[PDB]
Paper text:
One potential new drug target is 6-oxopurine phosphoribosyltransferase (PRTase), an enzyme central to the purine salvage pathway and whose activity is critical for the production of the nucleotides (GMP and IMP) required for DNA/RNA synthesis within this protozoan parasite. For example, T. brucei has three 6-oxopurine PRTase isoforms whereas there is only one 6-oxopurine PRTase in humans. These enzymes catalyze the transfer of the ribose 5'-phosphate moiety from 5-phospho-α-D-ribosyl-1-pyrophosphate (PRib-PP) to their respective purine bases (hypoxanthine, guanine or xanthine). Here, we show that two of the three T. brucei isoforms of the 6-oxopurine PRTases are identified as HGPRTs as a reflection of their substrate preference for hypoxanthine and guanine and the third isoform is identified as HGXPRT reflecting that it uses all three naturally occurring bases. In both enzymes, the active site is situated at the interface of two domains referred to as the hood and core and is primarily comprised of three pockets identified as the purine base binding pocket, the 5′-phosphate binding pocket and the pyrophosphate (PPi) binding pocket.
Numbering used by the authors:
A (entry chain D): 9 to 114, 132 to 234
B (entry chain A): 8 to 115, 129 to 234
């Protein structure tokens, strides 16, 4: 468990390291990983028994269980979800749920999604527009057996369209957060904890990368 | 967390009691992997923390700038096999206090970089493995020609030097592997086993186990 405090200048510290950009801590690494570990069991319990189209043996007409032959299809949204997805699939492996990951940037190279169980792994749902558009696009272009969304952070106070993620690790207020995949022009993406950003830092790096 | 390698009643390799029927042997357990990544982050921090490169945060500045959050180390992560490696390493680099930003490239070039200001920057390629050396040889040449960065270096999780058909030497290597096909921790066969925490040598009987297109 990480120790959260304040340094001599009032900056947020976690495990003795100062974070001058942070207004406060939303969730430390150990809290995030506990939430994701429980979510991995939640995802395993929801999918381990399901069956979907057999593409390993196309000669088999029946529905096949979720195995290494026909794993769960996971769509990971770059770039904000790559660190979240990296830890989740390993926790899913701990829970014995076979899965494969392809990436989308808002494109995939997976093509046999029809009749499959597909799970989207996204960093955050705020207004809901990003995932509302993605689910509609995947459903119309692939028609999976099922399509669900797992987000690391949900902001239900920001929802302005009709979208609700089925699986949520953390619930946050309508504040701009950084760390553990979240960033300000890619800065702070590699931090192990999620912080509320100081508004003074929101426009700190305006130059294009 | 020290891992225990053994065999089950059927003769399959086990790591911490979990059976891996696809594995012929263990190249490196999770603790071995993360120990080398922790030491590599220190090596990378020491090699870059005092260097300077072009200031693109303040375009009105003419002097070279240190590596800061304003002008961080540019990391190019090669999809897909390097994404788990990259996710762990950049967090270890944060532990070492090395500011960095990550963009992704996919090559067979399928997905291009979105970063555009690499000229005169220190750029670090993060790749999962170097086998024949071709993929990285071509990628080093393309980035050098297209951008001319201040420095361009390659950090691989696994080096297989016994497989070289071209002359390529990555500057930083976490682990060395025998000239075998490995799976686990980013490495896969048709995307299977990518999420395993240990690197195994795959059994030859599993080489073409999943031929169907995903
Ligand atoms: N770092 C951070 N980003 C947030 C946050 N909320 C939304 N977003 C936007 C997340 N994403 C922006 C990343 P980009 O590739 O465009 O730079 C867009 C996804 O937004 C979620 P939604 O469509 O509003 O539900 C937040 O709290 N912290
Ligand atoms: N799973 C596995 N793949 C190997 C191996 N060696 C090369 N490769 C090819 C890896 N790469 C593609 C697989 P990924 O999904 O990571 O993008 C190709 C890069 O090959 C390295 P090189 O050009 O031969 O030096 C190996 O031992 N195990
Ligand atoms: Mg992002
Ligand atoms: Mg952003
Ligand atoms: Mg590769
Ligand atoms: Mg930093």
């Amino acid at each position: 468990p990480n120790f959260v405090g304040r340094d001599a200048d009032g900056n947020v510290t976690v495990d003795g390291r100062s974070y001058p950009m942070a207004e406060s801590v939303v969730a430390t690494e150990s809290t995030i990983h506990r939430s994701m570990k429980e979510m991995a069991q939640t995802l395993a319990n929801a999918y381990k028994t399901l069956k979907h189209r057999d593409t390993h043996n196309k000669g088999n007409s029946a529905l096949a269980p979720i195995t290494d032959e026909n794993p769960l299809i996971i769509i990971s949204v770059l770039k904000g979800s790559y660190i979240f997805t990296a830890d989740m699939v390993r926790y899913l492996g701990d829970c014995g749920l076979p899965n494969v990951v392809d990436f989308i940037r808002i494109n995939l190279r997976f093509t046999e999604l029809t009749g499959k169980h597909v799970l989207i792994m996204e960093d955050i749902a705020d207004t809901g527009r990003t995932m509302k558009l993605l689910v509609e696009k995947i459903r119309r272009e692939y028609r999976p057996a099922s399509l669900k969304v797992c987000v690391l952070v949900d902001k239900p106070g920001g929802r302005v369209v009709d979208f609700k993620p089925e699986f949520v690790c953390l619930t946050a207020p309508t504040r701009y957060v950084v760390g553990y995949g979240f960033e300000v022009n890619d800065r702070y993406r590699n931090y192990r904890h999620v912080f509320v950003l100081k508004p003074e830092y929101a426009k700190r790096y305006p130059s294009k990368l």
